[PDB]
């Protein structure tokens, strides 16, 4: 993941599976994705998911409203991001079609509220950029967690 510069030096704008957003201000890194994922299953705030745009950059992460059907716009820069994970305990999302995909979540502070952070839950998509790798290098290059 040290040679992950290839992704940040480029700034890939890929497509991801949008699920839902959950508050994780009191949670930690992985636990954030946990409450976010579990709540999305137990409570199910969102019924049918959709494929939206996602941009990975070392200056911050950005969400993109490709179709603007549910609710998308942008994400949070490095000054707001606190953590990123591909899954809490290696859980997957079951699409209405029956196929299962990983569920990753990003922990970032919302503008105006630096004391709190929210974890936006998004399922994996775009086989060119592995979800279990994208957030992994992101955490390392964004926060400087790189070994």
């Amino acid at each position: 993941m040290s040679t992950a510069a290839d992704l940040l030096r480029q700034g890939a704008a890929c497509s991801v599976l949008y699920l839902t957003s959950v508050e994780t201000e009191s949670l930690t890194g992985p636990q954030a994705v946990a409450r976010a994922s579990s709540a999305a299953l137990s409570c199910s705030p969102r019924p049918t998911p959709a494929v939206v745009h996602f941009k990975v950059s070392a200056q911050g992460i950005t969400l993109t409203d490709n179709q603007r059907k549910l609710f998308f716009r942008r994400h949070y820069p490095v000054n707001s991001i606190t953590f990123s994970s591909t899954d809490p305990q290696d859980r997957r999302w079951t699409n209405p079609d029956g196929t299962t995909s990983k569920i990753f979540g990003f922990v970032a502070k919302k503008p105006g509220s630096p004391w709190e952070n929210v974890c936006h839950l998004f399922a994996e998509l775009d086989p060119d950029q592995p979800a279990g790798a994208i957030v992994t290098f992101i955490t390392k290059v964004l926060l400087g967690q790189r070994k």
Binding site: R9, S57, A58, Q59
Partner: peptide, 14 residues
């Protein structure tokens, strides 16, 4: 999908 993109930032690294 298949091709890896890279058009948005200014080539950063932490």
């Amino acid at each position: 999908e298949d091709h890896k993109p890279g058009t948005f930032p200014k080539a950063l690294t932490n």
